[PDB]
Design a protein around this ligand. Structure first.
Ligand code: J40
Ligand code: Y01
Ligand code: Y01
Ligand code: YFW
Lengths: 336, 286, 57, 235
């Protein structure tokens, strides 16, 4: 109909407001900040045992145990301190594309091409891990899942919709519609009241968990977004796309702040995450290596080279001690 | 004089040990190079490394001095390690051929019943034939003529031992490997044989290229093995039976011995430095 | 597909009705958070191996 | 180090690693095939045809990906049907990198038909575009394709009643089953740009119980043998 006219008028008004709010680029503000210097990280632990291309990992809240998911249908609970395999959950479907480790440390979730978010109960009364609940309702591959708490989990799938699940009942308490393409990443707020999703329509949306409505939309990328991670403050996030460029968006400023790009990089980002202080943005790449980015100055600080294949997953402990990068060559690597 | 030949033998020894060590290290430190065929190639490289660091050095010292200056016991051990490691290398070539033949003509066995235990069994079997060819001259089958000359080191020339060793070390492997690679050639040719005119011409050209490639590869393998070992085992069979009227020139005999010794240097070049997976691993190591 | 147009225009107006702050203030807040927690960032400043759990017990 | 808890943890890790090694050895003995096609291209008929005799060597139905595990002549096959995955293919097509072969099914009888999305798009043209896209992916450079042309009888009836020139304007020939079925096969063959690294095994699906799975087994064994010959340098 004629609603396209007012839709584009609203888009233009939003763009004008964002341009008006832009008075000083994040480079000008952080020019006085001294460089972080070269970041040298050496592989401390190399967890071995996977037999196919890893696709996800997630640290625990105790910063010691971590979960990894791989195409061999295995969900291994490692012990990064001693490399010991605490658990090895056999998946019903070997096509797993995401995993999460519950904040309480009791549950682990995974999902993939099967449109189901399986939830495993690690700590039970018999010492044997078993599938507590299987959450069905997505009509596309489930790309990411993050535990809101011990009882609620947020999943993002390739049906352009993110969902808030009630694990006890197994139904979608809330569904988050609005994305035009496949949602490929999802990051929870530190206070767990908000969460952003990076989708294949080259845009990211900030969602309210309670109300289930899109608060903001961030359109800066030229290609589909593969990763997203909230800055420790909770007021900003970084996105990694196949544009071979990472981007920092601020919630309050409602616009892009910094672009983490290099001419020598033509491969897409597969995973991003921040350090404890938020001053290093560690981004995995299809160039087989993870590049450490100084968030405030957009300088390539370090390089976590070592992986034989593409770096699919990446995460930083909650205490900020170490960063672990899983890769398609079936090896987790803790760097420190 | 002796400096030139000593330098040549030394550089040959160095190239052989360097190549075998590089192959073994690349297989050990790489996770992609950890399948049954690469295990057999690595065991061949290990055997050739033992040939280069346990036989080649003492053989070179014997060649340049033109006399044995290590003792009867050290000569006997050198002969034993000369026959054990070199016979094991030959049977490693035969075992690689057998593994390739099983992989090519029996895909079901390749998928289901191919495990590294098979690779270990084959390697143990190649070292077993090595031991059973190198040990019999230790106890019995040793004429006193061998010890009659302290300033010499020669393999026991008993006619029965000559037949037993020469056959079980080269001629049984040479017929077995010829049969296996002929069957592999037949299988490869059968697989290769089985606008529209442009596509037909392209298919014909590609089939001809594949036939040329397979005949070249089989030529390289069988030619190197034959041009290195056959000269040695023809002499090592005719000479013992012909005590007189068959004088052997020192130059030709030494060239022949070192041609077979150089088969251990040429083995990593063919079985390891030619395939794509080792080239990529070496590029990743460099 | 007219109802989806109404939903989209409502979403756009709701997004445009939110309050925004200057980018300089937001960048300054981000730079203050980074510098305030820079002491507790083991990746940023290499930590001695005595208390580093992944190298020395 | 030597504490009882650490000894128990290391023993648990060793037992788990042994179990993982056993499971990986078991999984390496299974031939993995990726089944693709456009809507009702007759892939369901193919799946049903292969699960008549040999099958499988509170759960929730997934509707995302379908598992078909069938054994034929001492060979374990695992067919992954992704026809119900209505999303961007390039975001998960790399998950199937390394499958032994791709079974691609197209119905011969849909040349007359058009897609429900728009009338001005032949179903055969959509299938040809899908074949061109999936045959020339960077993931499937060396992966051979087992092409199945389903519904030969319906295609024969349709070409008896309706001409084939509507699907292929450049086509020229007397309309009969053999030449038209050969022309469509050649058109699907010509979409393969990687003629040196991969081959296409085209079969016309038939009602016989064993012929289709027998052709799949023959193609898979011929792929394995050619891979083993390429590894030895003889191909
Ligand atoms: C008259 C008509 C026709 C005949 C006339 C002319 C044409 C033919 C002449 C005769 C041929 C002579 C030798 C040719 C070799 C040659 O072409 O080699 C190619 C080029 O590689 C390099 O250059 C790389 C080489 C690296 C070698 C190692 C370097 C270090 C050496 C010392 C090692 C010790 C210290 C490190 C590589 O190999 P290729 O093109 O020959 O083709 C194949 C090869 O034949 C197969 O054997 C091999 O299979 P495998 O052996 O069974 O595992 C295959 O993988 C493949 O490599
Ligand atoms: C001092 C010596 C021991 C060094 C090692 C030499 C080998 C590497 C040579 C000796 C004979 C050569 C072969 C002699 C002839 C041919 C055929 C040639 O052309 C053909 O493929 C035609 C074959 C035919 O017509 O029968 C390809 C190279 C090849 C296999 C040669 C490969 C290299 C070989 C094995
Ligand atoms: C297959 C590729 C790696 C090439 C392999 C070459 C070898 C077979 C060559 C290189 C150096 C050669 C040697 C160079 C010099 C001598 C000294 C020569 O002197 C003699 O004892 C005879 C003459 C005399 O009595 O003085 C005997 C051959 C020998 C050992 C040669 C044996 C054959 C060798 C080892
Ligand atoms: C009868 O003489 C023999 C029998 C078997 C043998 N295997 C290996 C050798 C020696 C190899 N270098 C002299 C080249 C050998 C000799």
């Amino acid at each position: 109909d004629q609603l396209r006219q007012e839709a584009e008028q609203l888009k233009n008004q939003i763009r004008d407001a964002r341009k008006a709010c832009a008075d000083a680029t994040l480079s000008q503000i952080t020019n006085n900040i001294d460089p972080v210097g070269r970041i040298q990280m050496r592989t401390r632990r190399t967890l071995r045992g996977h037999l196919a291309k890893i696709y996800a990992m997630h640290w625990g809240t105790d910063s010691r145990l971590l979960v990894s998911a791989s195409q061999d249908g295995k969900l291994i609970i490692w012990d990064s301190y001693t490399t010991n395999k605490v658990h090895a959950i056999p998946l019903r479907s070997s096509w797993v594309m995401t995993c999460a480790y519950a904040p309480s440390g009791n549950y682990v979730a995974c999902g993939g091409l099967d449109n189901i978010c399986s939830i495993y109960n690690l700590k039970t009364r018999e010492g044997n891990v078993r599938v507590s609940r299987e959450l069905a309702g997505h009509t596309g591959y489930l790309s990411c899942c993050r535990f809101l708490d011990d009882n609620q989990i947020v999943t993002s799938s390739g049906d352009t919709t993110c969902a808030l699940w009630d694990i006890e009942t197994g139904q979608q308490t809330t569904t988050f519609t609005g994305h035009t393409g496949d949602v490929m990443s999802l990051s929870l707020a530190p206070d767990t009241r908000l969460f952003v999703s990076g989708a294949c329509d080259a845009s990211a949306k900030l969602w309210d968990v309670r109300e289930g409505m899109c608060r903001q939309t961030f359109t800066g990328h030229e290609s589909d977004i593969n990763a997203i991670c909230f800055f420790p403050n909770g007021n900003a996030f970084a996105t990694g796309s196949d544009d071979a460029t990472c981007r920092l968006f601020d919630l309050r400023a409602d616009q892009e702040l910094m672009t983490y790009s290099h001419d020598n990089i033509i491969c897409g980002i597969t995973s991003v995450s921040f350090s404890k202080s938020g001053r290093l943005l560690l981004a995995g790449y299809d160039d087989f290596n993870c590049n450490v980015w100084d968030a405030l100055k957009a300088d390539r600080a370090g390089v976590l080279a070592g992986h034989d294949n593409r770096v699919s997953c990446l995460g930083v402990t909650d205490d900020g001690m170490a960063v672990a990068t899983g890769s398609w060559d079936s090896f987790l690597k803790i760097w420190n | 004089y002796q400096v030139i030949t000593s330098l040549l033998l030394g550089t040959l020894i160095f190239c052989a040990v360097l190549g075998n060590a590089c192959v073994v290290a690349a297989i050990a430190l790489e996770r992609s190079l950890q399948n049954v065929a690469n295990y057999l190639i690595g065991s061949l490289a290990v055997t050739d490394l033992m040939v280069s660091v346990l036989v080649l050095p003492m053989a070179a010292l014997y060649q340049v001095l033109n006399k044995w200056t290590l003792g009867q016991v050290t000569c006997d051990l050198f002969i034993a390690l000369d026959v054990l490691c070199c016979t094991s290398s030959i049977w490693h070539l035969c075992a690689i051929a057998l593994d390739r033949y099983w992989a090519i003509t029996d895909p079901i066995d390749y998928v289901n019943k191919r495990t590294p235990r098979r690779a270990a069994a084959l390697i143990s079997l190649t070292w077993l034939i090595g031991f059973l060819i190198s040990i019999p001259p230790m106890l019995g089958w040793r004429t006193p003529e061998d010890r009659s000359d302290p300033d010499a080191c020669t393999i026991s020339k008993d006619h029965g031992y000559t037949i037993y060793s020469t056959f079980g070390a080269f001629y049984i492997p040479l017929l077995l490997m010829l049969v296996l690679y002929g069957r592999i050639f037949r299988a490869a040719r059968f697989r290769i044989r089985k606008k529209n005119e442009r596509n037909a011409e392209a298919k014909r050209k590609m089939a001809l290229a594949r036939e040329r490639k397979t005949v070249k590869t089989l030529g390289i393998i069988m030619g190197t093995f034959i041009l290195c070992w056959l000269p040695f085992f023809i002499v090592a069979l005719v000479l013992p039976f012909c005590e007189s009227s068959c004088h052997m020139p020192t130059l030709l005999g030494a060239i022949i011995n070192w041609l077979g010794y150089s088969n251990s240097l040429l083995n990593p070049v063919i079985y390891a430095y030619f395939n794509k997976d080792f080239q990529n691993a070496f590029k990743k190591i460099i | 597909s007219i109802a989806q147009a109404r939903k989209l225009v409502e979403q756009l107006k709701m997004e445009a009705n939110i309050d925004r702050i200057k980018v300089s203030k937001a960048a300054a807040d981000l730079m203050a958070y980074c510098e305030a927690h820079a002491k507790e960032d083991p990746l940023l400043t290499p930590v001695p191996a005595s208390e580093n759990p992944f190298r020395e017990k | 180090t030597l504490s009882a808890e650490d000894k128990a943890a290391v023993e648990r890790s060793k037992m788990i690693d042994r179990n993982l090694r056993e499971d990986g050895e078991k999984a390496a003995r299974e031939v993995k095939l990726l089944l693709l096609g456009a809507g009702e291209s007759g892939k369901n008929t193919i799946v049903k045809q292969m699960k008549i005799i040999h099958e499988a060597g509170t759960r929730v139905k997934t509707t995302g990906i379908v598992e078909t595990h069938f054994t034929f002549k001492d060979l374990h096959f695992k067919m992954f049907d992704v026809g119900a995955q209505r999303s961007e293919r390039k975001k998960w097509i790399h998950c199937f990198e390394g499958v032994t072969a791709i079974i691609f099914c197209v119905a011969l009888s849909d040349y007359d038909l058009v897609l429900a999305e728009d009338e001005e798009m032949n179903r055969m043209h959509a299938s040809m575009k899908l074949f061109d896209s999936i045959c020339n992916n960077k993931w499937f450079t060396d992966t051979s394709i087992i092409l199945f042309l389903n519904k030969k009888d319906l295609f024969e009836e349709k070409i008896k009643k309706s001409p084939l020139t509507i699907c292929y304007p450049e086509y020229a020939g007397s309309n009969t089953y053999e030449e038209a079925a050969a022309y469509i096969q050649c058109q699907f063959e010509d979409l393969n740009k990687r003629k040196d690294t991969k081959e296409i095994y085209t079969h016309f699906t038939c009602s016989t119980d064993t012929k289709n799975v027998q052709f799949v087994f023959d193609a898979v064994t011929d792929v394995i043998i050619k891979n083993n010959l390429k590894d030895c340098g003889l191909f």
